[PDB]
TrEMBL record, chain B:
Naturally occurring in which organism (per UniProt): Trypanosoma brucei brucei (strain 927/4 GUTat10.1)
Span of the entire protein shown here: 319 to 354 of 370
Protein name: Uncharacterized protein
Gene from which this protein is expressed: Tb05.26K5.220
Domain of life according to the entry: Eukaryota
UniProtKB/TrEMBL annotation, chain C:
EC annotation from Swiss-Prot or TrEMBL: 3.6.3.-
Name of the coding gene: Tb06.30P15.500
Domain called ATP synthase F1 complex delta/epsilon subunit N-terminal: residue spans: 30-100
Official protein name in the record: ATP synthase, epsilon chain, putative
SUPFAM superfamilies attached to this UniProt entry: Epsilon subunit of F1F0-ATP synthase N-terminal domain
GO BP term, example: proton motive force-driven ATP synthesis
Pfam families referenced in this protein's UniProt entry, alphabetically: ATP-synt_DE_N
Keywords from the UniProt entry: Hydrogen ion transport, Hydrolase, Ion transport, Membrane, Mitochondrion, Mitochondrion inner membrane, Transit peptide, Transport
Subcellular localization: Mitochondrion inner membrane
Molecular function as annotated in GO: hydrolase activity; proton-transporting ATP synthase activity, rotational mechanism
One GO CC term, this protein: mitochondrial inner membrane
UniProt: UTP 1 binding residues: N55, Y58
Principal localisation: mitochondrion
From TrEMBL, chain F:
Record's GO cellular component terms: proton-transporting ATP synthase complex
Keyword Hydrolase assigned: yes
Protein's organism: Trypanosoma brucei brucei
Coverage span on the entire protein: 2 to 255 of 305
Annotated protein name in UniProt: ATP synthase gamma subunit
Keywords for this protein: ATP synthesis, CF(1), Hydrogen ion transport, Hydrolase, Ion transport, Membrane, Transport
Length: 124, 30, 161, 140, 65, 254, 123
């Protein structure tokens, strides 16, 4: 049941984002309702999250592949829908496996950002 | 009060999330 | 997430003279006459400026002591070192005089006395006086009397010259 | 396409009532539509409409809380479908008891269920509620 | 002078003076200055039905001061 | 064939859209061409206002110890299509949410955004028709309503957009402490060596009568509001020209 | 001549209203001038006033049909074009016959609205 409910919720989110994407392209992303901005951000993260590095494409991707167990696919997506990962950067979901990989990539991105901020601040 | 008388995988995700949130907050400060 | 204060983008700050410092002999007053966030004159070296505050008239020359003056509807005169007089009329505001040799006169409205018309001013006084007669209540009478004071000041200002 | 007006309040609830997975018995469907039509679901949140319908059909709050005074009109009497289909719901024989049952069901539902549902903040409780409401879509 | 006793604030005193000063300006020049003393502001709260409920806490026109 | 004409109708609509949007650019350009004058005549009215209120204080001690209503007066545009100005302002307000926060936003977009976002905190908003020039009377209307919203307010803040250049529109802040806290700081700047730059200014105000000081406080507060709205308008027109160009190119790609 | 002139004016107004509808979607109804919104408000009434319940579609509509005389139609539209009914609510022209039915429906709309206001007032 949890698998079915999560899948339907994901589909509903992506369906709505597609409809909002028509408005976004013509006018702009900033001419939308504040509620529809949250949906867009969640949908974009879902789109990035659906990507996965395959073990057979280690040449074309340049990265080690992943095998995601179905129980981590369900849990990771279910949490993302609830919004507990809204603070995580969008790109952290790109070309990764389970939620744990997303968090690790976010940690590395945060460390790099902190280093850049430290370098900029020290420049003063 | 009368309750007092008689009476890990998910933790890793929480731990990582807390660390990431901490780092994102620290970068904001300075 | 700290935001800049709106005064950081302004690069012409006010220079105050430390009290324990030597005096300087200044022959020019740097005037800044401003209306509704618009400067009619900017750091202009002038010989003197005459302003009407609530207490009375002040003639500000270079080196005048630090003082804050609450203006009233009245003319304002600026005399240049060349010997040229420029007369404005103000409806209110404040004048900040600094001992360093600067005078920042910020007015809600500052119009050259030429622009004002005495015929229009005169007939407005008659109408407002009639309005004061028909004023419903004490508050309405007070507001009408505010208009008459400005009008009479304008009429008297133009009749002077 | 072009403000909580009555048409817009009830229109959304009608749309939510149109989600189904299995065919519905005539008595259950007509009664629910009548309730949403006469404003009995105005105080009910859109998310909880299916849960409200499930209790109405497969349960009886009045009997549960001992406040049911109707003589014959109960949702568990499946034989009423043909009486409804003969006389209409807006007939003196069936109209009086129909309104009484709906009024009792609405009052009991709002008091004992919606108040607790709106007071849920725990992640465990939130997830449990989400499963319940989704299941109610696929049940009634 | 006497307006302070009636509760009129200083800001309202200035608006009245500015309007009067703009009144005396020549008809040729009145257009420029008068655009700076023409009330065009209101205070509105969105009503329950989705309308505009105007708050009457501060006056807009010098006549009603 | 209908299928072919379906595309033709679709492309027919995009053509009219380009024309209307281009007409919008013409309107904004005229308003920006006439609003470009303020760039020459700004940066001099607010000189002693700096001394009155310029206090580079910490961002935590200011809001942590709030025992009275903190009133915020964000500046927002009536019409959309401006850009990210309103969004950033909302982010700047969301970052300072507190128990004592009261909101009196300016502009329909601010009202619409904050009425939904902060129904209880939102008391009411001010709306100005962009028909006349931003004048003193409008600022006096902002301040009077702000006081009546919360007379016992610890501070009144204005959050607006500063137009640094044609392509740079930052967010700027004017914090205005109420009379009691201002006169207390003005009293310390006068007596104490601390706040040297304000020593002469403060003593020159304490010599005068109180009503003059109160008038001085209100007058400079109005000027700060007048500057903010004036800048927020210039940033608005500049931003709309940039945004409208983006819409034109998006409607050209389609 | 009156019939010809009225028909042409209706067609021109409908044509113009469609051009404005493009503006009303890009700019919005606020941006329209005083003249344009009067065209919009009058034209919307024309669009709804063209609708008519037929005597054969009672099952489909659930309301009795109407038979509008030729003279009544011309007079009703002529008055609408020149603004004789600018204060009538827009929905009063929806699925009705002649002008008389429009006034009756508006009166009924006013009565029900008053009842709703009274119910709200008691609350
Ligand atoms: O009873 C009093 C005493 C003093 N004051 C006010 O206190 C202030 C003291 O002002 P100052 O002592 O600094 O200078 P001043 O007498 O030369 O002032 P002006 O007339 O030139 O403006 C002045 O503004 C005076 O009007 C009163 O209003 N009432």
């Amino acid at each position: 049941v949890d698998h079915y409910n999560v899948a339907q919720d994901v589909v509903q989110m992506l369906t709505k984002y597609r409809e909002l994407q028509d408005i976004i392209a013509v006018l702009g992303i900033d001419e939308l309702s504040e509620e529809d901005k949250l949906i867009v951000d969640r949908a974009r993260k879902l789109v990035k999250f659906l990507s996965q590095p395959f073990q057979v494409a280690e040449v074309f991707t340049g990265m080690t592949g992943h095998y995601v167990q179905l129980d981590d696919t369900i849990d990771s997506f279910s949490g993302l829908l609830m919004g507990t990962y809204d603070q995580v950067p969008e790109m952290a979901f790109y070309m990764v496996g389970g939620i744990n990989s997303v968090l690790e990539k976010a940690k590395k991105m945060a460390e790099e950002a902190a280093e850049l901020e430290k370098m900029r601040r020290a420049r003063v | 009060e009368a309750a007092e008388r008689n009476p890990t995988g998910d933790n890793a995700r929480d731990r990582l999330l807390k660390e990431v949130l901490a780092l994102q907050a620290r970068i904001n400060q300075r | 997430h700290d935001l800049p204060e709106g005064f950081e983008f302004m690069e012409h700050k006010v220079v105050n003279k430390d009290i324990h410092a030597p005096h300087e002999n200044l022959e020019t007053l740097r005037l800044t006459l401003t209306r509704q966030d618009e400067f009619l004159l900017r750091e202009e070296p002038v010989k003197c400026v005459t302003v009407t505050g609530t207490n009375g008239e002040y003639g500000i020359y270079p080196g005048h002591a630090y003082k804050i003056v609450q203006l009233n509807p009245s003319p304002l005169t600026v005399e240049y070192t060349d010997g040229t007089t420029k007369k404005y009329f103000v409806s209110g505001g404040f004048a900040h005089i600094n001992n360093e040799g600067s005078c920042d006169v910020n007015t809600v409205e500052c119009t050259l006395l030429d622009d004002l018309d005495l015929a229009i001013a005169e007939k407005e006084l008659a109408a407002q006086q009639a309005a004061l007669g028909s004023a419903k209540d004490d508050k309405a009478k007070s507001v009408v009397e505010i208009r008459i004071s400005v009008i009479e000041a304008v009429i008297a200002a133009l009749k002077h010259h | 396409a072009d403000v909580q007006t009555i048409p817009m309040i009830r229109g959304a609830r009608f749309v939510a009532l149109f989600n189904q997975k299995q065919p519905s018995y005539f008595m259950n469907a007509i009664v629910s539509l009548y309730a949403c039509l006469n404003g009995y679901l105005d105080d009910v949140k859109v998310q909880y409409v299916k849960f409200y319908e499930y209790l109405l059909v497969h349960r009886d709050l009045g009997i549960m809380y001992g406040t049911a005074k109707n003589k014959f009109f109960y949702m568990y009497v499946q034989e009423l479908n043909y009486l409804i289909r003969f006389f209409t719901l807006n007939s003196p024989i069936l109209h009086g008891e129909l309104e009484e049952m709906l009024k009792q069901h609405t009052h009991l539902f709002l008091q004992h269920y919606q108040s607790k549902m709106n007071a849920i903040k725990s992640e465990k409780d939130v997830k449990a509620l989400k499963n319940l409401l989704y299941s109610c879509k696929r049940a009634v | 002078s006497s307006w302070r006793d009636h509760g009129i604030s200083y800001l309202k005193y200035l608006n009245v003076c500015t309007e009067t000063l703009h009144s005396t300006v020549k008809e040729s020049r009145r257009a420029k200055y008068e655009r700076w003393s023409k009330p065009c502001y209101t205070a509105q709260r969105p009503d329950g039905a989705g309308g505009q409920e105007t708050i009457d806490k501060v006056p807009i026109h010098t006549k009603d001061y | 064939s209908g299928k072919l004409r379906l595309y033709k109708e679709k492309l027919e609509g995009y053509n009219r859209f380009y024309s209307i949007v281009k007409t919008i650019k013409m309107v904004t350009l005229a308003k920006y061409r006439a609003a470009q004058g303020r760039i020459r005549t700004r940066d001099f009215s607010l000189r002693y206002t700096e001394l009155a209120f310029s206090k580079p204080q910490a961002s935590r001690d200011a809001v942590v110890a709030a025992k009275n209503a903190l009133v915020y007066i964000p500046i927002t545009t009536n019409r959309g299509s401006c850009g990210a100005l309103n969004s950033n302002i909302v982010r700047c307000i969301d970052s300072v949410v507190s128990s004592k926060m009261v909101l009196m936003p300016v502009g329909k977009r601010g009202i619409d955004s904050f009425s939904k976002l902060y129904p209880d905190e939102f008391r009411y908003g001010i709306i100005n028709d962009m028909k006349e020039s931003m004048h003193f009377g409008y600022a006096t209307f902002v301040i009077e309503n702000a006081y009546e919203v919360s007379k016992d307010a610890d501070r009144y803040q204005v959050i607006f957009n500063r137009f640094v250049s044609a392509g740079v529109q930052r967010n700027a802040v004017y914090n205005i402490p109420s009379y009691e806290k201002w006169k207390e700081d003005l009293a310390d700047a006068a007596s104490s060596d601390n706040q040297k730059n304000r020593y002469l200014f403060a003593n020159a105000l304490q010599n005068e009568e109180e009503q003059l000081i109160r008038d001085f406080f209100d007058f400079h507060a109005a000027l700060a509001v007048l500057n903010a709205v004036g800048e927020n308008e210039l940033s608005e027109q500049a931003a709309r020209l940039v945004a409208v160009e983006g819409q034109l190119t998006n409607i050209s790609s389609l």
